[PDB]
Amino acid sequence: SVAPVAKANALRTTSSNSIL
Amino acid sequence: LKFRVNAQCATTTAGGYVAGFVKDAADVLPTGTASIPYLMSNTGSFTQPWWKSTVHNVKIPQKLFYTEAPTRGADAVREYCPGQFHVLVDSKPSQICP
Amino acid sequence: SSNSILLKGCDRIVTVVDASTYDAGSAIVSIPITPDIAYRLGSTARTFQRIKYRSLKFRVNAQCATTTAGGYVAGFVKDAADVLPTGTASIPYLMSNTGSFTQPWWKSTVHNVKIPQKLFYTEAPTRGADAVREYCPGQFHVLVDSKPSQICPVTVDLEWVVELHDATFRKESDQTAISAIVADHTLNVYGLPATSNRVGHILISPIGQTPKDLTPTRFATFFGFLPDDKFCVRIPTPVDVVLTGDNVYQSVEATHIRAYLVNGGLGIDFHLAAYNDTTHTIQPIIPTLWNVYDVTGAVTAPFTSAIYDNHVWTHKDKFVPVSFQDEPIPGTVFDYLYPRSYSLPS
Amino acid sequence: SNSILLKGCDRIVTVVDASTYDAGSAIVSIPITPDIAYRLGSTARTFQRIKYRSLKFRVNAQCATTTAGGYVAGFVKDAADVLPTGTASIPYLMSNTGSFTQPWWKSTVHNVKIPQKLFYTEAPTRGADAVREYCPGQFHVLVDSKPSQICPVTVDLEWVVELHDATFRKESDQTAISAIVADHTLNVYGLPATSNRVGHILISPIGQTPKDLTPTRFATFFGFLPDDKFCVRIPTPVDVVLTGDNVYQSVEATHIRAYLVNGGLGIDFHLAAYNDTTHTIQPIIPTLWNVYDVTGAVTAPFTSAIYDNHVWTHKDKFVPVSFQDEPIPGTVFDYLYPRSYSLPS
Amino acid sequence: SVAPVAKANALRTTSSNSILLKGCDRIVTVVDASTYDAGSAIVSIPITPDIAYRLGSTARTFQRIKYRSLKFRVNAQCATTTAGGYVAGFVKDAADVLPTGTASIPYLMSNTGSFTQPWWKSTVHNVKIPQKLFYTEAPTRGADAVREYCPGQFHVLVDSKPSQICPVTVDLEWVVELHDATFRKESDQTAISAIVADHTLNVYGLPATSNRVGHILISPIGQTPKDLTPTRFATFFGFLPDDKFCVRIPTPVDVVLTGDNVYQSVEATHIRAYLVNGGLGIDFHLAAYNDTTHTIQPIIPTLWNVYDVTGAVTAPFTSAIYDNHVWTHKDKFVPVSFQDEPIPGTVFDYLYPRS
Amino acid sequence: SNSILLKGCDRIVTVVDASTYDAGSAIVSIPITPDIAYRLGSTARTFQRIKYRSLKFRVNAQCATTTAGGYVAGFVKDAADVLPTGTASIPYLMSNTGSFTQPWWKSTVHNVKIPQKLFYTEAPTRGADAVREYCPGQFHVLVDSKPSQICPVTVDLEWVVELHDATFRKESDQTAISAIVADHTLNVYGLPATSNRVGHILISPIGQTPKDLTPTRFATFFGFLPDDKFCVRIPTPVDVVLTGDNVYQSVEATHIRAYLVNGGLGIDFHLAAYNDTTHTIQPIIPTLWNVYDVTGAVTAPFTSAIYDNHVWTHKDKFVPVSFQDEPIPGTVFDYLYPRSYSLPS
Amino acid sequence: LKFRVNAQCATTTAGGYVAGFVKDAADVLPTGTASIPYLMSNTGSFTQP
Numbered sequence A: 001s002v003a004p005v006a007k008a009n010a011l012r013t014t015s016s017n018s019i020l
Numbered sequence B: 001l002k003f004r005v006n007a008q009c010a011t012t013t014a015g016g017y018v019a020g021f022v023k024d025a026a027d028v029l030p031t032g033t034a035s036i037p038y039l040m041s042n043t044g045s046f047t048q049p050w051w052k053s054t055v056h057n058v059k060i061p062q063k064l065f066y067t068e069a070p071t072r073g074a075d076a077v078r079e080y081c082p083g084q085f086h087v088l089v090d091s092k093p094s095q096i097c098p
Numbered sequence C: 001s002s003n004s005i006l007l008k009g010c011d012r013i014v015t016v017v018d019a020s021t022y023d024a025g026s027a028i029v030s031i032p033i034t035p036d037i038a039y040r041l042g043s044t045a046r047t048f049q050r051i052k053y054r055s056l057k058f059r060v061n062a063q064c065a066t067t068t069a070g071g072y073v074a075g076f077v078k079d080a081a082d083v084l085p086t087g088t089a090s091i092p093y094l095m096s097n098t099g100s101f102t103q104p105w106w107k108s109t110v111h112n113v114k115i116p117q118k119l120f121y122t123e124a125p126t127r128g129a130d131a132v133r134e135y136c137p138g139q140f141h142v143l144v145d146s147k148p149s150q151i152c153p154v155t156v157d158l159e160w161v162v163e164l165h166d167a168t169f170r171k172e173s174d175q176t177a178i179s180a181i182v183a184d185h186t187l188n189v190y191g192l193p194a195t196s197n198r199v200g201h202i203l204i205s206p207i208g209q210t211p212k213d214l215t216p217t218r219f220a221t222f223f224g225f226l227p228d229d230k231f232c233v234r235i236p237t238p239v240d241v242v243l244t245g246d247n248v249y250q251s252v253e254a255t256h257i258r259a260y261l262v263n264g265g266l267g268i269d270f271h272l273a274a275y276n277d278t279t280h281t282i283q284p285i286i287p288t289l290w291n292v293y294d295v296t297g298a299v300t301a302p303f304t305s306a307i308y309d310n311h312v313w314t315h316k317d318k319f320v321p322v323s324f325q326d327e328p329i330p331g332t333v334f335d336y337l338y339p340r341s342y343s344l345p346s
Numbered sequence D, F: 001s002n003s004i005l006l007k008g009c010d011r012i013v014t015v016v017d018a019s020t021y022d023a024g025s026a027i028v029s030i031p032i033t034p035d036i037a038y039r040l041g042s043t044a045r046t047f048q049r050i051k052y053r054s055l056k057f058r059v060n061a062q063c064a065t066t067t068a069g070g071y072v073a074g075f076v077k078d079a080a081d082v083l084p085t086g087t088a089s090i091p092y093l094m095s096n097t098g099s100f101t102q103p104w105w106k107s108t109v110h111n112v113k114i115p116q117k118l119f120y121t122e123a124p125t126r127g128a129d130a131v132r133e134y135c136p137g138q139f140h141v142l143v144d145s146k147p148s149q150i151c152p153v154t155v156d157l158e159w160v161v162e163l164h165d166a167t168f169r170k171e172s173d174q175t176a177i178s179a180i181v182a183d184h185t186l187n188v189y190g191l192p193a194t195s196n197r198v199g200h201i202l203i204s205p206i207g208q209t210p211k212d213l214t215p216t217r218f219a220t221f222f223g224f225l226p227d228d229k230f231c232v233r234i235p236t237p238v239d240v241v242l243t244g245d246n247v248y249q250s251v252e253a254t255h256i257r258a259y260l261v262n263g264g265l266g267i268d269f270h271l272a273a274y275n276d277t278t279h280t281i282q283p284i285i286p287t288l289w290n291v292y293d294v295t296g297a298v299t300a301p302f303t304s305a306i307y308d309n310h311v312w313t314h315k316d317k318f319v320p321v322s323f324q325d326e327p328i329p330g331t332v333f334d335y336l337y338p339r340s341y342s343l344p345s
Numbered sequence E: 001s002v003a004p005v006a007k008a009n010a011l012r013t014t015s016s017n018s019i020l021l022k023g024c025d026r027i028v029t030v031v032d033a034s035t036y037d038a039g040s041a042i043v044s045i046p047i048t049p050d051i052a053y054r055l056g057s058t059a060r061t062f063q064r065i066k067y068r069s070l071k072f073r074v075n076a077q078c079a080t081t082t083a084g085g086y087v088a089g090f091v092k093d094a095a096d097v098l099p100t101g102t103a104s105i106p107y108l109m110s111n112t113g114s115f116t117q118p119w120w121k122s123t124v125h126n127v128k129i130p131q132k133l134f135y136t137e138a139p140t141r142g143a144d145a146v147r148e149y150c151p152g153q154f155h156v157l158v159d160s161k162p163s164q165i166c167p168v169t170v171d172l173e174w175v176v177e178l179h180d181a182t183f184r185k186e187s188d189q190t191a192i193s194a195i196v197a198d199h200t201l202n203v204y205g206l207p208a209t210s211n212r213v214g215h216i217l218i219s220p221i222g223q224t225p226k227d228l229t230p231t232r233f234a235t236f237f238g239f240l241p242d243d244k245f246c247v248r249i250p251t252p253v254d255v256v257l258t259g260d261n262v263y264q265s266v267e268a269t270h271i272r273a274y275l276v277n278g279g280l281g282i283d284f285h286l287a288a289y290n291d292t293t294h295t296i297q298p299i300i301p302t303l304w305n306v307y308d309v310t311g312a313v314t315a316p317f318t319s320a321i322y323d324n325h326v327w328t329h330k331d332k333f334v335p336v337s338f339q340d341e342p343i344p345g346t347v348f349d350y351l352y353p354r355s
Numbered sequence G: 001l002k003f004r005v006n007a008q009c010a011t012t013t014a015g016g017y018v019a020g021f022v023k024d025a026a027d028v029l030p031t032g033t034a035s036i037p038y039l040m041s042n043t044g045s046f047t048q049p
Ligand SMILES: [Ca+2]
Pocket: B066, B067, B068
């Protein structure tokens, strides 16, 4: 295993739902 | 519930963090550097270097909680809270880590 | 069934260490495997007699920066009683042991130890001699191969799985033993000059020759915790004291160092001491305050002067805290009354 | 090939009247080694190691259902473990896997699954006392609540073992002997120097004043009658200082020994040690203590002496040895200095 | 291809194998048993890899051993004109200590394989110890549990005192399994006792006006004690002393230093060898660790230094009184450095060639 | 039947900082004999001959990719061959069949196919030094280009061998010891005859004037502290001539020995040889040198003496022996005269 | 190779010897004081009056 300059916070798009 | 701990720093930054979830509202982590190994004995329990960001899913008991604390009568804390989430500083970051 | 379980869990075996402050070859982790090493494991293991370690996985969390050069050697020596050489030469010794490896300070690993499927006792034997081999499958180590340039925080966790067998409950009737936290100085007693006020008193003598009394913030820096007028300790080797008065003479082994109130109780100092048969308790051996029986049964304090033998104590010496009447003090009681900085292991 | 399989059965504890024990005290707490059963012992003394195939304890109490109270029994499977010595022993013992409670009128039999390990048959005479190697654990019978009337209790052991590695050893190396009564002590005083009473062993009833140790009292303290050649190794040595003209010498009193006085009519007891001159334990009376000078000649230059005060309780264990410091065996001791025959121990 | 901050040395866990060895070594050699009386044990060595050169060398590289076969060969060089005999045998318990000897013979004889023989005949013993897995070293930390690292001890008792010079030798022909690979430190030299039972070492302190009154002397149990010439030391111990011979005493001897207005008692814990007259001779004296010099020194009043409360060093002692003591062939002296460190075997062997 | 198959692994070289080596110099050049690995050594000392089934060298360098430069490693399969000792070593070594080059930040493992011959396990103590019989060749790690920053380097050896023919031998017969520094020398002068300084060993920093050899300097030259009984066999004997009234004698100085001066406060170092009179190595001071005459009587007839000038460099190998000329073992020497613990050698 | 060591010394002679074969032409033994246990480690070696 190799060490990077940096690892980036896992890209996660906030997702919601519509309600009644 | 999934907690996203982000730390936007380079692998040059030494040290790490410890995170996890205590599944009782009443419980109270010992307030020293001793908090860490206590928290670590709880079932969810990450340690990562400051440069490594995580996501932590937390299986929560499928009980119904009240949504607010009691304004009347006694403060039975376990009825409205499923427990605390913690992120502790194992070892101080060697440089600015946000 | 009962009388037998299978238990899994992950706990913290050892809390943070900065390897950047450790001489090459020294161990930053040197831990004998016993159930009490892990919070959850130790608690449940108390409720059984024998244990079998099915899997032990050491999670070594090395969080040194990816630039910081150098590495660590870590292994598991398979004998509780063995002891690595205090030197840089420990490392090639340890490398020779099975399952050993190096890895740079930034690289954490999860090393799996393969433990003999023998049943061990779960606790140190309360009766008899401390055969460490009976209850400990071995020691887990982490040595500093190449001392880190910069800060280098390192920790260890354990993934364990064990069988617990034969169900009892232990008191637990455990007791502590202290030694000095720091090694840059010693504490000692003096018998010369006979005239002095601090004769038989305990003093701290640094590398800097001159002895000095215990502030006791001085005591604090030697033992790692604060004193208390109820502090008493058993000495590894007794110290001869010679009481003498008007046509009377007695010899006494100073078996204890005790704290005692000084000049109207708003002060504390430390003196040599032994169990007094009259008082049925541990008192500081002071001529006028030392009482004794005579043939008739009467008690008297005829001693006017005393001659204490010189003696020094080091980091190496093992003290053991005991309530007056040398009654051993439980581990949790001592840790409360006399709290040291929280570390793991203890 | 040498090894054997021995069945048998043997009284472990002889009858006792439980109505005299307090609540919390044990009528039995006994580490299982072969030497407790007669038959088992006498054969296993001719073998080095042992496996306990089977153990069944028979607790008998021959009393009527009129007798109130009960007992608690069980087996702790670790030689090292030590039941808390209060009334607290009971609930601790009860948390162990075998754990009866019965009324005093109900007798039982208790089988004990023992780990199938090989134990040594004797404790180590050399090196450290790693107790777990020769004992699989203790058997206990505790007095939950004192019997309301005379209830006599016994314990038999049905046993089956395997024996291996052929040797032979004697019933004992040595014996240890403690006091029978607990409201007394033995004392040495040296404090009033001029007294002719210093150095001699005395009996103090803890409240009362101490008095000279006479055979009739000795009896009530130790459970047997002393004699001309009673001698004992004390557990902690006592310091002694002898002096004369141009002469001083420190001597550790390592024994209490009997010696005879006023022609041999009576006998008294004195601190004592081995005299390199005579190669015998002697009573350390300054005029009578002999030493070598550098030329090898023997003198007795001492005239004064200072004994350090010391005390001994029912907790102290004295070991009988002959003069010459040869520790005297159990069988032999019991023969020379007989006490009441109880069995356990 | 991309360049990292760093690449980590390929993780490789050292892996070894367990072996089965055969071999043989001289296990013990004695000279002149003759002085030893009936029941004395001229040989009783507890079996451990340490004892044999060759075994001990390999066993050093393993944590755990299993002695599948031990075969002992007892010889005695005593000519066929020597009367008397011996019993030899193996006791399968590291802890057992024999009766006194007078009666040890019939005990040893009850242990299987044990044989009785005249001095001028040899015996051979095939001992087996299957299915038992020992450590290869006495525990460093913790209590010394003899049974963990030792399968028994091998004895040779004098049955009838030999009439003439009767040196004895035991040779072991072993075959073992070794497991769990480690590497240990060299073996520290073990306790030493006399090679002769008709002599004692002695310290007399009594005639205080005497020149040699803290010294160690050798008394032929018959007559008056003599000074310890190196040649005598050798006849008693088996080797020649040197100027840094220091050895730990079995039980400490009390000593009392003194001068006007100054008193101090000193637990004498060693016998040092010091230099006698202007660095050409050598004598032996009671000794103790000196906190002033951080070394074990002979307890001579005028040369014994101590700290005082100020921290300063002073030599205020003018007279001194030594309690008498006696050492015998039955006593165990542990060779140590002037720092009370046990010296490793090979170093001892080099400083102290036997004979 | 005696023979075995041993697996293991062992540190060959302990960590070093490559950033301090020059280009062309080797951080390792090491002839493979069992005595370098601890585990391997300690077992193969109990066997006469050996086959190397497997050898894998692990070169570790725990540094960041920021560190410039690289290393070259490989194995020369002949014990006799000798890499040219310049920066030229590198391209020579590279022509051998195994031959890595890597940047300092890249650690490797190098397997080495070794001829399946049986080697002796030790060098010959008798007869000629036919080196090819006990060594299959040297392993080298050379500094191509000096590391731009601290790069710590180690070498482990994964090994698998067969061992045959059962014997036993000690870690060493003797040891050889050279200088630690290279900008100095040791000197003997006899040239200004009248000087009280002749014959004694001195330290000259090659440019500076020579000065008396004192413990503190001795330390910086040899890497350890001398003492009362430091003695050494020199590689080339030095001639010495003693004279008196009707008396002359030539004596080869075969040792440098320490002796003590001015009461024993300090110590100095002198040419020395074995004295047949006293059976000990002695410092060859005319008044103190004793000899036999034909009648067997011992005299010390010498009053003058002439020492021949000699020089010693960091290239000279001194061998420690006790007086009596018994060469002292490595383990023992290291114990008596401790230096910094490095591993290879 | 089969070696037969005899010694004419009569049964009244005390002392003994060790005999054995070292499978290396180059080995030289310890000094003797300690050669005995070395020689004894080489297989086939026997100690005898
Ligand atoms: Ca609400």
